[PDB]
């Protein structure tokens, strides 16, 4: 038993992390087969930060303007191209530590592990969610750009996030590994701000199911709710709408615990109305929204 924010073992990702330098700018790159992936803003100077013309700055670069270092080894760049906001440096060596991997773009509510890196050296691993507003609440200092987010279901590393920037509210924005930003963000230092964030309702319900599996029943009630009445209440607390897809996804946890999805919704409505009255659920005094139904089943 027990229930923790658990990350994937980071070793398969550790063996892919390198340091990329261009001019006076150093950040992290991801070395898979014979390609190093990094944020394209590595090629920006101090004036290029507001309105970088990336096609223009990249055509002015030669393979030898990029210093790529895998621990102590210098890797030789032999090609470079841009895909959206990601730079792809071709190198003369395939990474012998390349794992089975794929690139996947995730939806809001999805969780993943982040391997925070500085100078191509891993610092730490933690769990994140893609917030409904397409940001992540990370822990990222200067030098962390090019750090990645991943899942490892079944020996295959699914890359879903590369870190590009910190927004003024202290939250983080980045791309999939095809270089397309999550949300409306751009790799320019023009004024940008995240939308008002919301709570990931389906994940809160999954975590209440976790709590019941782990033996805590205090917050259940004898009530039920319609899906529509639930959404009308939950949205007044800045909760995301719960769709029939969400209700379908919780079916297995419903079945394991014998609590119907809309009975659990009634429990959530009451918890939003009452708070916890000094109690905790799975060590938390807040309603936790960064565990998915799939994470709850994996850990339980």
Ligand X SMILES: CCOc1cccc(C(=N)N)c1
List, by residue number, the catalytic residues: 41, 145
Query: Which option in a copy of itself, Cl ion, Na ion, none does residue 115 bind, with CB closer than 5 to 8 A by kind?
Result: a copy of itself
Decide: helix, strand or coil at residue 157.
strand
228 binds ligand X (CB under 6 A): no
Question: Given the rule CB under 5 A, which of 39-47, 138-146, 220-228, 241-249 is the region that contacts Na ion?
Answer: 220-228
4 binds a copy of itself (CB under 8 A): yes
Q: How many CB atoms lie within 10 A of CB 128?
A: 21
205 binds Na ion (CB under 5 A): no
106 binds Cl ion (CB under 5 A): yes
Q: 48 is written with which tokens?
A: 């290029």
65 binds a copy of itself (CB under 8 A): no
Report the residue closest to ligand X, judged by CB: 244
Q: Considering just the CA atoms, what is the radius of gyration of the chain in Å?
A: 22
238 binds a copy of itself (CB under 8 A): no
DSSP type of residue 235? G
Residue among 134, 99, 91 nearest 115 (CA): 99
Question: Given the rule CB under 8 A, which of 40-48, 77-85, 265-273, 280-288 is the region that contacts a copy of itself?
Answer: 280-288
100 binds a copy of itself (CB under 8 A): no
Nearer residue to ligand X within complex by CB, 33 or 248: 248
Decide: helix, strand or coil at residue 37.
strand
Residue among 291, 6, 295, 14 nearest 147 (CA): 14
Compute the least distance from the CB of residue 57 to a copy of itself, in Å.
27
Nearer residue to a copy of itself within complex by CB, 9 or 79: 9
Tell me phi and psi for residue 265, to 5 degrees: -60, -40
Q: 127 is written with which tokens?
A: 């769990």
Q: Number of residues interacting with ligand X: please give it, by CB under 6 A.
A: 2
45 binds a copy of itself (CB under 8 A): no
Whether 67 and 21 have beta carbons less than 8 Å apart is answered as yes
State the Cα–Cα distance between residues 115 and 33, nearest whole angstrom: 19
H or E element that contains 87: strand 86-91
110 binds Cl ion (CB under 5 A): yes
State the Cα–Cα distance between residues 266 and 222, nearest whole angstrom: 9
Compute the least distance from the CB of residue 125 to a copy of itself, in Å.
5
Decide: helix, strand or coil at residue 42.
helix
Residue among 262, 251, 260 nearest 226 (CA): 262
Nearer residue to Cl ion within complex by CB, 53 or 72: 53
Q: Among 24, 51, 74, 142, which residue interacts with a copy of itself (rule: CB under 8 A)?
A: 142
Residues at the site binding a copy of itself, with contacts judged by CB under 8 A = 1-12, 14-15, 115-119, 121-128, 137-144, 166, 170-172, 214-215, 276, 280, 283-286, 298-300
**Chain positions contacting ligand X, by CB under 6 A:** 244, 248
């Amino acid at each position: 038993s027990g229930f923790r924010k658990m990350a994937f073992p980071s070793g398969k990702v550790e063996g892919c992390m390198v340091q990329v330098t261009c001019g006076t700018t150093t950040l992290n790159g991801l070395w898979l087969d014979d390609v190093v992936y990094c944020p394209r803003h590595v090629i920006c100077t101090s004036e290029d930060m507001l309105n970088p013309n990336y096609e223009d700055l990249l055509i002015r670069k030669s393979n030898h303007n990029f210093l790529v270092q895998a621990g102590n080894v210098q890797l030789r760049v032999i090609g470079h191209s841009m895909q959206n906001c990601v730079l792809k440096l071709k190198v003369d060596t395939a990474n012998p530590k390349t794992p089975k991997y794929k690139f996947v773009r995730i939806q809001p509510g999805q969780t993943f592990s982040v391997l925070a890196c500085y100078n191509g050296s891993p610092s730490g691993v933690y769990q994140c969610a893609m917030r409904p507003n397409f940001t992540i609440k990370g822990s990222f200092l200067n030098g962390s750009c090019g750090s990645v987010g991943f899942n490892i279901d079944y020996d295959c590393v699914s890359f879903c996030y590369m870190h590009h920037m910190e927004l003024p509210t202290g939250v983080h924005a980045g791309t999939d590994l095809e270089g397309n930003f999550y949300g409306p963000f751009v790799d320019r230092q023009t004024a940008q701000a995240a939308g008002t964030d919301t709570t990931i309702t389906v994940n809160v319900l999954a975590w209440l199911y976790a709590a019941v599996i782990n033996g805590d029943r205090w917050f259940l009630n004898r009530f039920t709710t319609t899906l529509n009445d639930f959404n009308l209440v939950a949205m007044k607390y800045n909760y995301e709408p719960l769709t029939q897809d969400h209700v379908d996804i919780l079916g297995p946890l419903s079945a394991q615990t014998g609590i119907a999805v809309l009975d659990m919704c009634a429990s959530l409505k009451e918890l939003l109305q009452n708070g916890m009255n000094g109690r905790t659920i799975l060590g938390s005094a807040l309603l936790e929204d960064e565990f998915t139904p799939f994470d709850v089943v994996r850990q339980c």
